[PDB]
């Protein structure tokens, strides 16, 4: 079986996830992690620093990890021209989007736990609307459908510039998606329910590019 797609791209998944979690904590893992060797040693200094910033950067970078690691090595596969014979053995785009949704649901469980079981930890160790938990497990569920035809690199006109139309579309997503949730308020407070629609309107231009008829 050609399950190799998920087995290869999960390496890039974990690689880009760890290399982008140690960055954005560089100025903490330098400063306070170095000052703790001489100055002060409690347990909840390094544990406090580990608890600093981990849930929102988890829930934000792990979708980025998916649509950037699925861009990188699968574009290497395109530019080493391997899909042009894999494609040429009775397959279609269906097998790539099936592999993409399989790796996306494999990361859906960690994308689920780093909100659902990191919430009360965030309360207790950070004090020191429920549609959002469907939109967040949906926004990893859509990038696997979105980037698979978007970086479809030709063997003769190839480049790394293809990451820009996959990152700015996520940015025009995520400037709006969290700003419409700061409208309204907390919990049972009610802003406009157009966040029920922006996910669907992104599913629309996902699925047309995946169709291409």
């Amino acid at each position: 079986i050609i399950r190799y797609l998920v087995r290869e791209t999960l390496k890039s998944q974990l690689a880009i996830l760890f290399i982008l979690l140690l960055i954005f904590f560089c100025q903490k893992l330098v400063r306070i992690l170095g000052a703790a060797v001489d100055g002060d040693i409690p347990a909840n200094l390094v544990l406090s620093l580990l608890g600093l910033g981990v849930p929102e950067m988890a829930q934000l970078i792990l979708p980025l990890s998916l649509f950037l690691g699925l861009l990188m090595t699968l574009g290497k596969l395109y530019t080493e021209s391997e899909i042009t014979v894999m494609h040429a053995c009775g397959l279609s785009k269906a097998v790539l989007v099936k592999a993409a949704m399989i790796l996306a649901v494999f990361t859906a469980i960690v994308a689920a736990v780093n909100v659902m079981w990191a919430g009360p930890w965030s309360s207790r160790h950070q004090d020191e609307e429920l549609n959002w938990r469907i939109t967040l497990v949906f926004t990893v569920f859509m990038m696997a459908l979105m980037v698979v035809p978007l970086s479809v690199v030709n063997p003769r006109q190839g480049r790394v510039l293809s990451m820009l139309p996959a990152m700015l579309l996520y940015l025009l997503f995520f400037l709006i998606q969290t700003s419409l949730k700061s409208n309204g308020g907390k919990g049972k407070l009610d802003p406009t329910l157009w966040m029920w629609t922006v996910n669907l309107i992104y599913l629309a231009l996902a699925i047309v590019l995946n169709l291409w008829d």
């Binding site: 690689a15 560089c26 170095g34 000052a35 934000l60 990451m163 820009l164 990152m167 969290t178």
Partner: protein
């Protein structure tokens, strides 16, 4: 000229990696600032050039290594070595196109990035220091961080050493055509220089030192460590 070619590919990937970091961290700040405080359209360029000054050399590391590895996998570096390039392509190419990209970040942090946060400070008035020059430091001496900002000013060469022995690990790899399995180890084994260099700083004071050579030793020892 291979100088302007390798500068072309590293510059075109380095804009990508810098955008990918700073436009991410901008929305990192945007989501919790509009969570707690707040209103519509200033928060993006609220904090851009100081984020450039922070995230520039790490993006330099990541992009230079990743683009040079993507070029390197298709045997271009081994055939340019076969024609007669050496460490000289590193020295007068990747340095020669990367440290002029850190001179203007020093320019942004000397010229306008303190004003880049002054604009944020005096636009805080609708709601409810590690960035300076010598003009406070020599009176702070009479008033520690006695040469810590002096070391902060001195970083075209720390980024050079940061990047240099890092991409020395990608100058080599030749087991078959090793396919980027170790560029992650290259950025890993080169990442710990911020863990060591900035924290060797507090180690200097404890037994009596001139902080000039106290800052110039850990930066230049790793310059000397891997001259292959």
């Amino acid at each position: 000229v291979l100088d302007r070619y390798i500068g072309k590919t590293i510059f075109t990937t380095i804009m990508m990696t810098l955008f990918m970091l700073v436009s991410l961290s901008g929305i990192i700040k945007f989501v919790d600032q509009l969570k707690k405080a707040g209103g519509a359209g200033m928060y993006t360029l609220l904090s851009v050039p100081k984020d450039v000054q922070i995230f520039f050399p790490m993006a330099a590391l990541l992009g230079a290594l990743l683009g040079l590895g993507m070029l390197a996998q298709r045997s271009e570096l081994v055939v340019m070595q076969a024609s007669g390039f050496t460490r000289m392509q590193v020295a007068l190419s990747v340095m020669k196109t990367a440290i002029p990209l850190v001179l203007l970040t020093m320019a942004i942090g000397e010229w306008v990035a303190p004003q880049g946060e002054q604009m944020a400070r005096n636009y805080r008035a609708q709601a409810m220091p590690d960035a300076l020059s010598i003009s406070g430091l020599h009176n702070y001496v009479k008033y520690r961080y006695q040469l810590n900002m002096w070391s902060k000013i001195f970083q075209p060469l720390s980024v050079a050493v940061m990047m240099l022995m890092a991409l020395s690990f990608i100058f080599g790899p030749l087991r078959s055509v090793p396919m980027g399995v170790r560029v992650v180890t290259g950025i890993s084994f080169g990442f710990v220089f911020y863990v060591l260099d900035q924290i060797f700083g507090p180690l200097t004071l404890v037994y009596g030192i001139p902080p000039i050579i106290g800052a110039l030793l850990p930066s230049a020892s790793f310059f000397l460590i891997s001259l292959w």
